[PDB]
A = this chain, B = another copy of it.
Amino acid sequence: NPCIEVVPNITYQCMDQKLSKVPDDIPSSTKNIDLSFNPLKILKSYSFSNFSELQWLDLSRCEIETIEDKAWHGLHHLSNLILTGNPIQSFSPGSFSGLTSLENLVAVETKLASLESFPIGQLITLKKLNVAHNFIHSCKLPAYFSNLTNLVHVDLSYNYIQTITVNDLQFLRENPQVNLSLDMSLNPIDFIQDQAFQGIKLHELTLRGNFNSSNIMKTCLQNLAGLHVHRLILGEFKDERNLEIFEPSIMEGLCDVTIDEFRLTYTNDFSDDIVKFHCLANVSAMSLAGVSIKYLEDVPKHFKWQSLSIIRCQLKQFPTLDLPFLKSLTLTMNKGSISFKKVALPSLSYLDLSRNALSFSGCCSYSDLGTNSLRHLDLSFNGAIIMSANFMGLEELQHLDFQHSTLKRVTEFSAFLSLEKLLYLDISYTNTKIDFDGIFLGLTSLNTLKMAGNSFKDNTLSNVFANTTNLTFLDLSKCQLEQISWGVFDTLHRLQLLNMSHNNLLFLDSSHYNQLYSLSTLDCSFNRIETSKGILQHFPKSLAFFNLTNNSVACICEHQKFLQWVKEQKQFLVNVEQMTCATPVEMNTSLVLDF
């Protein structure tokens, strides 16, 4: 093997060795080869006959200039064939013969010249086809597409497509049943013949980076009349030529299209009135991503937006919204630091304001977001939440998440008191000195706590888990505990994962954990335990995992019973192998006294 092997007997990465043919010493029954950047210069017949198990073949950057007739002869299960970079200018007929299950042909930058001089009419399983960067001059879909039943995507980006005509898209007019998804980014389009799109039904249509004259864009977009697209994606790119003036007059012509999901990506110049255009009112799911918006002041009330996403977009103020049909608002990763403000969304059912510096001073009131149907709140990674109410109107919330947001006044009263049906709480890494035994009161249906960077008073785990019976997952890592009080865990009958690593415990006890009937994992690594007092026959007979690593479990005959139990019931412990002792002599595993 002049080439590397990743996995024994499979996955033979043979990239970048001076090769001129497939190595013959490659074992059969492989599933993945990679012959990339090898200086092959011609494929030869039957070369892959032996590899009748290959389902992923890559030939990138090889200098392949021609192809013999029975080149891919013995290939029967090849799903993916990549041919990027090879200057195969002419695909003479008969190519791609032996392949009977090819689902993904990639032919990027192979000096192709037209979609008709492409003998793929027989590949009746081709899901995707990628011919980007390939000198093509016309969008004309050839007729043989009628054979390719399971074709759902075509990529023509970065070609020389110049104009669109009515005889193109004819295959789409005769067949109203194809689910095709086009893509024509970075093509210098300037002329769309009238009535071109008519009775057409695409599932996606990207047009990023095409036009550079507000006039030409206006006219071309106007000629899109009759189109019926399920997702229209517009915008520009940062490293390209682009419009220097953008006005809602451009969006004229879109007023008779039948958009279902209008996506608008980065735009160089952006005026806030664009989204206030009278012929977006029937769009079902608005979305912005990277636009330099400043104020989303007021949109009309006859808009039928059922969704709205604002990701990576600048903002100088929390938007003002009163849409009566909108649900599932999302404002993530905002570039600025904003403060929350009241909204009125009677049909909201999903909120997500993560990763912003949303400093949300007032808190948990129905008066804040007017919705009696919230089900997913997410305020993680924000600036500083200040609790001043018990979520008095939001009694349907099922998913709550603070993860790196400074959470204040949570201990001063029994917050979370009205959330009678909540399943996933998360307050990790919110610096929260638990010094009140009623903080988790009312959460009768919780299933998952997650607190990591939260201290306690006395560095002692108080009794804060009463009336929390259904808890199944619990996490207490990284708290700086130094002991566990007596009486905790006396009712957590269904807990199954107890996490306590990275603490500062000193010993361990078994009087606890005696009621944890269904427990299955008791990770206690890194927490400096020396022994295990109490009767050791009271652990549950369901434990499967015991992390006792990086401790200083001492083996100077200290609790000989424990030093025997640790090497006896070790089919459960984790990495019993490297169990060092910490009292001279160290480097040991067993103690002399047996039984």
Contacts and interface: CB of A to CB of B under 8 A. Distances in A.
Interface of A: 336-337, 339, 357, 359, 361, 383-384, 386, 406, 431
A336 B361 contact: yes
Contact of A361 (B337, B384, B406): B337
Nearest to A317: B339
Contacts of A361: 336-337, 357
Chain A at the B interface: SS class: loop
Contact of A384 (B336, B383, B386, B431): B383
A538 B354 CA distance: 56
A-B CB proximity, top 3 nearest: A337-B361, A359-B359, A383-B384
A406 B339 CA distance: 17
13 contacts: A336-B361, A337-B339, A337-B359, A337-B361, A337-B384, A339-B339, A339-B359, A357-B359, A357-B361, A359-B383, A383-B384, A384-B406, A431-B431
A591 B408 CA distance: 51
A359 B361 CA distance: 11
Contacts of A386: 337
A318 to B, nearest CB: 11
Nearest to A480: B480
Contacts of A431: 431
Contacts of A357: 359, 361, 384
Nearest to A361: B337
Contacts of A383: 359, 383-384
A359 B384 contact: yes
A431 B453 CA distance: 13
A356 to B, nearest CB: 11
A384 B383 CA distance: 7
Contacts of A336: 361
Contacts of A406: 384, 406
A383 B359 CA distance: 9
A431 B406 CA distance: 12
Contacts of A359: 337, 339, 357, 359, 383-384
Interface centre among A361, A383, A384, A431 (most CB of B within 10 A): A383
A429 to B, nearest CB: 11
A341 to B, nearest CB: 10
Contacts of A339: 337, 339, 359
A340 to B, nearest CB: 10
Nearest to A360: B337
Contacts of A384: 337, 357, 359, 383-384, 406
A383 B406 CA distance: 10
A336 B361 CA distance: 8
A335 to B, nearest CB: 10
A361 B384 CA distance: 13
A336 B362 CA distance: 10
A502 to B, nearest CB: 14
Given A337-B361, A339-B359, A359-B384, 17 more contacts: A336-B361, A337-B339, A337-B359, A337-B384, A337-B386, A339-B339, A357-B359, A357-B361, A357-B384, A359-B359, A359-B383, A383-B383, A383-B384, A384-B384, A384-B406, A406-B406, A431-B431
A357 B386 CA distance: 11
A352 to B, nearest CB: 21
A386 B386 CA distance: 19
